[PDB]
């Protein structure tokens, strides 16, 4: 009900001018005469009543004023003369009108403007050009006051009728461009434009090789036990929050994070040659930051990290509630490693050797070989 | 009845002189600017003299310096005094405003001869 | 870039409509001389070109456009009598103006406002009022053209302004739709507000009674092992959309959807006396279903599920990845429950029976007493 | 013979009102859940309204306030008061159980046509 | 003594160019990760630049294109290029790695202004 409002205020401000025009006209007028007064209390009046009135339903007030309008400016300028200026109004009218009504009343409006026209063909022939009231210079004034006056009128509404359209629009913009930066941030990009097609139809994304690594908590019903649910709850935010922007710096992808468990993998939006070294290296800054973190008890929090790599596959399921996923037997492997490892170590596999030897160091200890870290010479 | 008659045409030698006068029924003169028109037959009517709210006034070439245009605003009338008159001047003589003048809704004119008789 | 096309659209069809009305204007003057044809040509050819060289660069352009129509005006005007028209021009200019420029250049646009004004105030009094140039009606017929040519020029060009702000406005507001929708389908409406505000705080919410239902599937490593991963994921993307629509014809809440584990949580958006009724009839529906619904494979697909009650709490957390999330004991019960549960079957403990052994059946083997299903009897 | 037949459908202005009637052989209704379909055309048939067993009812969004889902054990029975009818509802309505829903096993429903005849 | 010590900042017109030097001691640079921060007072000082032990980088969207993270192994240093500097970019910054990160066991940074003078 917006389009609304954009009328209805240009049609108010533009009775408020026209009646604030036509006041100082009035004033100025000296031994004019009150056969005009008559009509001229009816004019004013009339215009200053009908954005008082402007409930009584449709749009038949609109164009009521536009009645009024016309009916006045032809009885006052039929007696006067076609030099005092009544041809210039019309034709602002003729513009003007078109911009006051919506668009499902084009034709109407159209009409009007050529109701407009005919009378200002009529009003050079018909009304007696030059009938002069009383004293001349007057109407010098007259005159020179219609030609601004019908510059002024125009200006003013077109410049306010514009106001409001570019200032919705900038409330607009903002209203979506939230929502907007909300969804990508849920989401991946290419993804999100194959949800938002009403076009359904199944995303699975085959990956011949990616990597995955989670991270979980240990005796974390213990520290439950002892601390309120709701701090609890704060203590798991913050130490994921910390997590998140570790992962968000070093570029890889969380894809969940459910209760203690944190979930990370490595190339699936885009493959890269290096993919498992970075996750390598990824878990060692993670460490770092976990053996730092502080819970609310004081006793550090331990960590069992796993990691697996191979082929995967990523995609949307279900019909609701939809997120980004990924599936495959690195998914397993990964599960159990982490299921089996130690306090406070990172566990990996035959694979994750290949990869990681060269450009790594692992020792001691399916067959698993414990990862110490990253080769300190260069 | 908005109408504008003339008067003072007629029939003068090479040379002489005529007060043409023009009165108009149903406006005010005093706002309106104002022309004196005429036509032989050769076009139609070429506009001789013209005069402004305001006082000012302008002319065809071939006539300057020899027709006149004044104004009676407490008649509310305009004149053409016209000098050295010739026989490129015999025709028929108009009266308006630039309204009545584009909307074709004038009056006969008035008749002015040039020759000897 | 929007404002900006519709300024130079609305430009250019105001080019292109003063060209035609000019040259129709130009085909009909007869006998009216040559010494008009020369700046008549000027000016014909001068507007056509603005719109083909509006490159040069910044508003200059536009206000060239103006400066030559200005010029062009005055000059004919001059020569030619006053009640041509050249009088209606300056007018619809003067409110044409204003549109055709943007915003930031109000105070500009005003100014050229007030000098088409100080044309005008003028152009009665200085031009010779009527001087007449070779035939009078032709003049007749030129003051008559003008009127309507100065209605139709503002009538076209305003409304085709509004029909690009409408039209900006519709395909606007069905991309923010979307994404809307899509939001809302993701998380709950309440909590979104809270996500979308700049405004960071934690987001807790304790809940005083709630349960929760887990179901998983049987063997899938097996079923795994003989199909192909991509059919895989289609198969689980149709089960879990007839779960889901189940789901929503319950009214029940979905949290999420882990591999092949699915959770369903009762009452936390809003509580209820009869949450823990409602989530006993679902299982069994959910039992039907799912004892129905078939698997690539042809062996029927045994789901495993146990149900929980008591109070919970509700939130996200981290910083990035968000989603509505649940905790308490009574998901430790359910995961535990779902856990040691047989195959086909539903398992709930001391509690689930208080609540609904009055309205519902149980019975056989913490201890736990298995869920038959509904009382026959009503 | 486990069936559901449909009854009750016909023809109607815009702003009648109708009653559709569901009944079931072949098994216990207390015990059920149970939804009211209908096909357009435009897609499958998307569900209007759904009643549990032990009362709970849901309705489609496009739908509510206006159709109300109402049962009859004694019977074996389902009903569908529809109230404010329009254009959009003229369809094809079906009744069902989860179980028939998700395995195709249905009746031919019951026409309704919202039109001026 | 585990300490971190910036340097470069200073004083530049809009459009300028500048290189902040962040030099460590107490830790190997090879083996570590690392970023550069930056506080105006609107908030807490956010990461616009990410360096990691293998060559990796990463930046905040805000400032991509513009600002460069390298590297110094046999000093044990890490440098900032940054150009087309500009209003908002007048800052505070500040270099660490992801444990003194989290820990706040920080220098005071660097002055970086971006006006004309
Ligand atoms: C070849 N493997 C697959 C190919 C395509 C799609 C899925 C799989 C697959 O192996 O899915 C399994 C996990 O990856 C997958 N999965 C588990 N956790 C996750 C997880 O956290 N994220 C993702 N994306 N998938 C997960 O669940 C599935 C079952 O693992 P469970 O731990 O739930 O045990 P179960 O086999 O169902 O037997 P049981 O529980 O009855 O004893
Ligand atoms: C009093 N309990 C809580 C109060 C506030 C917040 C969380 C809890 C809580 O008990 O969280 C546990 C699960 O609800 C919560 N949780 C598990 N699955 C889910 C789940 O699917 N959804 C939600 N919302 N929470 C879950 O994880 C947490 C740990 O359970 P795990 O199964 O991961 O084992 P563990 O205790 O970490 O020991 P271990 O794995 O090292 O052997
Ligand atoms: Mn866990
Ligand atoms: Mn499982």
Redesign the pocket.
């Given at each position: 009900v917006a389009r609304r409002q954009r009328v209805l205020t240009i049609t108010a401000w533009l009775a408020v001018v026209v009646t604030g025009s036509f006041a100082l006209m009035q004033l100025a007028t000296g031994a004019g005469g009150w056969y005009i007064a008559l009509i001229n209390v009816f004019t004013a009046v009339t215009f200053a009543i009908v954005p008082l009135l402007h409930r009584f339903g449709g749009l038949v007030a609109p164009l009521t004023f536009i009645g009024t309008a016309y009916v006045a400016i032809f009885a006052i300028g039929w007696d006067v003369g076609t030099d005092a200026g009544a041809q210039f109004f019309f034709l602002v009218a003729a513009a003007l009108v078109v911009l006051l009504v919506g668009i499902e009343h084009t034709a109407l409006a159209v009409g009007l403007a050529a109701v407009a026209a005919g009378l200002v063909i009529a009003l050079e022939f018909l009304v007696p050009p030059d009938t002069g009231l009383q004293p001349p210079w007057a109407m010098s004034v007259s005159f020179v006051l219609t030609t601004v006056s019908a510059c002024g009128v125009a200006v003013a509404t077109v410049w306010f009728a514009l106001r409001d359209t570019a200032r919705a629009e900038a409330v607009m913009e903002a209203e979506h461009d939230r929502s907007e930066a909300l969804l990508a941030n849920m989401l991946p990009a290419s993804i999100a434009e194959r949800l938002k097609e009403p076009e359904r139809n199944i995303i699975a994304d085959k990956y011949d090789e990616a990597s995955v690594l989670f991270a979980?908590?240990?005796?974390?019903?213990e520290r439950?036990?002892s601390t309120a649910?709701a701090d609890?709850?704060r203590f798991?935010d913050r130490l994921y929050s910390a997590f998140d922007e570790l992962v968000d710096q070093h570029g890889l992808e969380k894809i969940k994070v459910?209760?203690?468990?944190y979930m990370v993998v490595s190339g699936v939006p885009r493959p890269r040659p290096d993919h498992t070294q970075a996750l390598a290296d990824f878990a060692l800054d993670m460490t770092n930051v976990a053996a730092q973190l502080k819970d609310p008890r004081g006793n550090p929090v331990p960590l069992?990290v796993g990691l697996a790599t191979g082929p995967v596959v990523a995609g949307v399921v279900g019909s609701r509630r939809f997120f980004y996923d990924v599936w495959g037997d690195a998914v397993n492997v990964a599960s159990r490693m982490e299921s089996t490892d130690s306090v406070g170590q990172i566990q990996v596999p035959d694979e994750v050797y290949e990869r990681l030897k060269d450009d790594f160091v692992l020792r001691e200890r399916m067959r698993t070989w414990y990862l110490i870290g990253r080769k300190v010479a260069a | 009845q908005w109408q504008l008659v003339e008067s003072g045409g007629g029939l003068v030698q090479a040379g002489g002189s005529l007060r043409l006068s023009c009165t108009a029924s149903g406006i005010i003169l005093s706002i309106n600017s104002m022309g004196w028109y005429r036509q032989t037959a050769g076009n139609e009517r070429e506009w001789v003299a013209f005069s402004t709210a305001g006082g000012s006034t302008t002319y065809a070439d071939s006539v300057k310096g020899r027709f006149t245009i004044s104004r009676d605003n407490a008649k509310n009338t305009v004149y053409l005094q016209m000098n050295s008159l010739k026989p490129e001047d015999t025709a028929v003589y108009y009266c308006n405003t630039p309204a009545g003048r584009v909307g074709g809704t004038w009056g006969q004119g008035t008749p002015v001869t040039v020759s000897s008789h």
């Open positions: 979980d908590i240990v005796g974390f019903t439950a036990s649910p609890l709850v798991l459910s209760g203690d468990s069992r | -």
